[PDB]
Amino acid sequence: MIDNEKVTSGHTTTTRRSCSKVITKTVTNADGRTETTKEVVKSEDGSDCGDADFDWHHTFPSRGNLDDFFHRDKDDFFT
Protein backbone atom coordinates (compact mmCIF):
# COMPACT_ATOMS: atom_id res chain seq x y z
CA MET A 1 0.00 0.00 0.00
CA ILE A 2 1.17 3.61 -0.46
CA ASP A 3 3.55 3.00 -3.39
CA ASN A 4 5.90 5.79 -2.23
CA GLU A 5 9.21 5.71 -0.30
CA LYS A 6 8.78 7.49 3.06
CA VAL A 7 10.80 10.68 3.63
CA THR A 8 13.45 8.39 5.16
CA SER A 9 14.47 10.94 7.82
CA GLY A 10 17.94 10.24 9.26
CA HIS A 11 21.36 11.83 9.88
CA THR A 12 22.14 10.39 6.43
CA THR A 13 25.59 9.81 7.98
CA THR A 14 28.57 11.94 6.86
CA THR A 15 31.89 10.64 8.25
CA ARG A 16 33.11 7.18 7.15
CA ARG A 17 36.43 5.27 7.76
CA SER A 18 37.47 6.94 11.06
CA CYS A 19 34.83 4.51 12.35
CA SER A 20 33.55 1.18 10.99
CA LYS A 21 30.68 2.10 8.61
CA VAL A 22 29.09 -0.46 6.24
CA ILE A 23 25.90 0.49 4.31
CA THR A 24 24.29 -2.28 2.20
CA LYS A 25 20.64 -1.84 1.07
CA THR A 26 19.52 -4.45 -1.46
CA VAL A 27 15.93 -4.03 -2.80
CA THR A 28 14.53 -7.11 -4.59
CA ASN A 29 11.11 -6.37 -6.16
CA ALA A 30 9.35 -9.48 -7.51
CA ASP A 31 8.37 -7.20 -10.43
CA GLY A 32 11.86 -7.99 -11.86
CA ARG A 33 13.63 -4.83 -10.56
CA THR A 34 16.77 -4.99 -8.41
CA GLU A 35 19.06 -2.18 -7.13
CA THR A 36 22.10 -2.76 -4.85
CA THR A 37 23.58 0.07 -2.78
CA LYS A 38 26.85 -1.11 -1.21
CA GLU A 39 29.45 1.08 0.56
CA VAL A 40 32.03 -0.70 2.79
CA VAL A 41 34.46 1.71 4.55
CA LYS A 42 36.61 0.32 7.43
CA SER A 43 39.28 2.45 9.18
CA GLU A 44 42.55 1.56 7.40
CA ASP A 45 44.51 3.08 10.32
CA GLY A 46 44.28 2.47 14.09
CA SER A 47 40.74 0.98 14.08
CA ASP A 48 39.27 2.11 17.42
CA CYS A 49 36.12 4.31 17.22
CA GLY A 50 33.22 4.59 19.69
CA ASP A 51 35.31 2.78 22.34
CA ALA A 52 35.35 0.00 19.72
CA ASP A 53 33.43 0.78 16.51
CA PHE A 54 30.63 3.32 15.89
CA ASP A 55 27.70 1.38 14.38
CA TRP A 56 28.26 -2.30 13.39
CA HIS A 57 25.77 -3.04 10.58
CA HIS A 58 25.67 -6.49 8.92
CA THR A 59 23.81 -7.72 5.81
CA PHE A 60 19.98 -7.83 5.62
CA PRO A 61 17.99 -8.73 2.46
CA SER A 62 16.21 -5.32 2.52
CA ARG A 63 15.85 -3.94 6.07
CA GLY A 64 14.88 -5.09 9.59
CA ASN A 65 17.91 -5.09 11.93
CA LEU A 66 21.75 -5.01 12.00
CA ASP A 67 22.04 -8.47 13.59
CA ASP A 68 24.19 -6.45 16.02
CA PHE A 69 23.23 -3.06 17.53
CA PHE A 70 23.61 0.41 16.04
CA HIS A 71 25.66 2.94 18.05
CA ARG A 72 27.69 0.04 19.51
CA ASP A 73 29.91 1.27 22.38
CA LYS A 74 31.44 -0.60 25.34
CA ASP A 75 34.80 -1.23 27.04
CA ASP A 76 36.62 -4.32 25.70
CA PHE A 77 37.27 -5.46 29.28
CA PHE A 78 41.05 -5.81 29.74
CA THR A 79 43.16 -8.68 28.36
Curated annotation (Swiss-Prot):
Subcellular location: Secreted
UniProt PTM comment: Conversion of fibrinogen to fibrin is triggered by thrombin, which cleaves fibrinopeptides A and B from alpha and beta chains, and thus exposes the N-terminal polymerization sites responsible for the formation of the soft clot. The soft clot is converted into the hard clot by factor XIIIA which catalyzes the epsilon-(gamma-glutamyl)lysine cross-linking between gamma chains (stronger) and between alpha chains (weaker) of different monomers.
Cystine pairings recorded for this chain: 19-49
Domain comment in the entry: A long coiled coil structure formed by 3 polypeptide chains connects the central nodule to the C-terminal domains (distal nodules). The long C-terminal ends of the alpha chains fold back, contributing a fourth strand to the coiled coil structure.
Subunit structure: Heterohexamer; disulfide linked. Contains 2 sets of 3 non-identical chains (alpha, beta and gamma). The 2 heterotrimers are in head to head conformation with the N-termini in a small central domain.
Protein role: Cleaved by the protease thrombin to yield monomers which, together with fibrinogen beta (FGB) and fibrinogen gamma (FGG), polymerize to form an insoluble fibrin matrix. Fibrin has a major function in hemostasis as one of the primary components of blood clots. In addition, functions during the early stages of wound repair to stabilize the lesion and guide cell migration during re-epithelialization. Was originally thought to be essential for platelet aggregation, based on in vitro studies using anticoagulated blood.
Name used for this protein in its record: Fibrinogen alpha chain
Organism expressing this protein natively: Bos taurus (Bovine)
Organism lineage: Eukaryota, Metazoa, Chordata, Craniata, Vertebrata
The gene coding this protein: FGA
